[PDB]
Amino acid sequence: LVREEVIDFSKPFMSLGISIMIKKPKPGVFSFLDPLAYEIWMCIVF
Amino acid sequence: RGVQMLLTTVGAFAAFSLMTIAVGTDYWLYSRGVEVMTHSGLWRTCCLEGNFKGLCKQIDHFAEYFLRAVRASSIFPILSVILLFMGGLCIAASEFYKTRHNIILSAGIFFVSAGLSNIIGIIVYISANAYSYGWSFYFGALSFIIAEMVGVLAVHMFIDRHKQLRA
Amino acid sequence: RGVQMLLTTVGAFAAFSLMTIAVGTDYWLYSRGVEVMTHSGLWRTCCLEGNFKGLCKQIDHFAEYFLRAVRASSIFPILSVILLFMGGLCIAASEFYKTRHNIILSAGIFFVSAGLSNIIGIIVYISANAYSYGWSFYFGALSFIIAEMVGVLAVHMFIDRHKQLRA
Amino acid sequence: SALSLSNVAGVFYILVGGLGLAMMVALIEFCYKSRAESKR
Amino acid sequence: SALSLSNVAGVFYILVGGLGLAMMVALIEFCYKSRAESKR
Amino acid sequence: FSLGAFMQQGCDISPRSLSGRIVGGVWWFFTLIIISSYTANLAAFLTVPIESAEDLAKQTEIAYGTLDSGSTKEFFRRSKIAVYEKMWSYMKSAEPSVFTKTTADGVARVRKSKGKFAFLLESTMNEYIEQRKPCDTMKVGG
Amino acid sequence: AYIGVSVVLFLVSRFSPYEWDPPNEFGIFNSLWFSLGAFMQQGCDISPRSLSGRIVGGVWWFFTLIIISSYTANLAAFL
Amino acid sequence: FSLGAFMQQGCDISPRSLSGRIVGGVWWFFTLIIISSYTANLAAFLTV
């Protein structure tokens, strides 16, 4: 808006948007519990 | 049998109180559905953060129809509370009638059935939901555990009474 | 009894020596890390060949931080050495007090615990690595088997002493 | 990728139904034996 | 493809912890029984 | 008995009464189904910080910034959203200055900061840099 | 782990004089047989009855379940 | 005994001698490997 008040813009030729860039970045010891949900384990114990 | 009877009475009262609190309160699920961090229960949804702190809505629970109806009515947690109350009544009545041994057997059966219905209610609740779990859910789980232990104690007392009678 | 106890003493000394050598030496692993072929132990890497053959450099060790701390401290191999030493001390002191039967049991428990901590240390080392293994790795692996066999021998002596005492 | 309780709740229902059925059978047998003993 | 020791190191830890726990339980019972025998 | 049955082992006793055998049979069926579902892909499961702008706003460990003069700094300046107002409030008093002279300098700062810095820039430039060497940056959130 | 489990099972099943004719059938040879039969999913002729022996048996059963299931699942991928 | 071991079903007897236990152990290892290889893709062969 602030630029449009002093210069004329054509119709957009490419879309965009503010985004977030971060640096990029093996299961735990208890990875054997992964195949079943935590609720399933609780109900199995019960 | 005095220590066992005291432990059974204390455990029965503890299980009943825990299950009653779990059914009564509104800290079963820490979800995000209003969307600002609401804590839910078996019947209400209250906002833990935002412009509406302290306002509690009413949960809309509506094969699939049967699951929704059973989750809405909460027949199984309420039935577990009722069975725990009946087991406590049997425990109390067994003192007045020290010669009728089947009352303690009835108490044990009631406690085991209450635990089983608590299992069923937990299964129905978790299935109907599909976040974290609040202290009412764990109160219900602890009530199940204590109900099972107290039922074991009651059955053991029944066996002990009949063995002593046989001797 | 004499032959059994001689076997126990010889095995205890062999296991202690093997574990101490495995901890103190540097031929645990043959890896092309530092990128020239190198033999690495618990505490340092030494260049196996090349220009600077024989130069030794201390290991640079630094959920995951805990694993690296445990591996860097090498608390489990050293604990296995210490427990083996205590078991040997119990075996040596058992002749001094021939009527104290629990010293043999203490030695057996010490040897079994030393073997278990050896297992834990081996697992921690292999996990923290993530090539071939040298003779110091297989000295500690051999020290585990003897410590478990000497732990079986000491328990049998404890049982035999009490079987004799019961008659 | 994990398996959810909704996928395997039917086996829990079957298990609890079987536990209830076994309790009912045991209680029925006990009641019959007790009544027969009382008659004797 | 071949899963390594790091993938299954937790179950080994649990196994050794259970072995240690069993030894501790057995030794506690032995000490209690020895105290009872000595007192008696 | 119940433990050994689930672990697919078996014990030295077995129920002999009708009700005990009903309990054993239903527990065996439950064990069969649950263990078959568990062990179907056990090996697969063994071998397998910022999600949005509110995550950046609510934390302090990771610093964020924009270009010195551009549309993004102005967007954060006049934004009336609470999260973006907080983000601009942090940026204005951030020391050292988080505003970068060029996009490339900000990307280099992100790469060299070891995950302690986040760069707010247009989606097109982020998509370009993401798919270039050394491939050590990525876009988070929408 | 097999060696350690068998040794600990024998120890906890036979060391104490206050349980002793053997109190059970869990000498070192029979402990090794029990552990091998548990691991191979081939059942067992005997089973432990003490609390500590049952702890050893349970942790061994959990270990062999996880390990054998992992082996079979990964072999299915290898094949 | 051997048939029950192969079917992974067990029987009411088990060897007690060292040599009999060696035979049982090697048969158990053979059964484990062969059955694990056989049952990996059994339904795929049934359907095709």
Residue numbers in the entry:
A (entry chain B): 485 to 509, 513 to 533
B (entry chain Y), C (entry chain Z): 6 to 39, 56 to 83, 94 to 161, 174 to 210
D (entry chain C), E (entry chain B): 789 to 828
F (entry chain B): 583 to 630, 636 to 729
G (entry chain A): 534 to 553, 570 to 628
H (entry chain D): 583 to 630
Show passages lifted from the paper.
GluA3 exists as two variants in vertebrates, GluA3(Gly439) and GluA3(Arg439) (hereafter, GluA3-G and GluA3-R). To assess this gating transition in GluA3-G, we captured the receptor in an open state (in the presence of l-glutamate and the desensitization blocker cyclothiazide ) and monitored the conformational changes using standard 3D classification procedures. We further processed particles using a well-resolved NTD dimer (resulting from docking to the LBD), and these displayed clear features of activated AMPARs: closed LBD clamshells and a dilated gate that matches gate dimensions of other AMPAR subtypes. We also observed selective interaction of the extracellular TARP β1 loop with the B/D LBDs, while the other TARP pair targets the A/C KGK motif40 through their β4 loop. These contacts are conserved in apo and active GluA3.
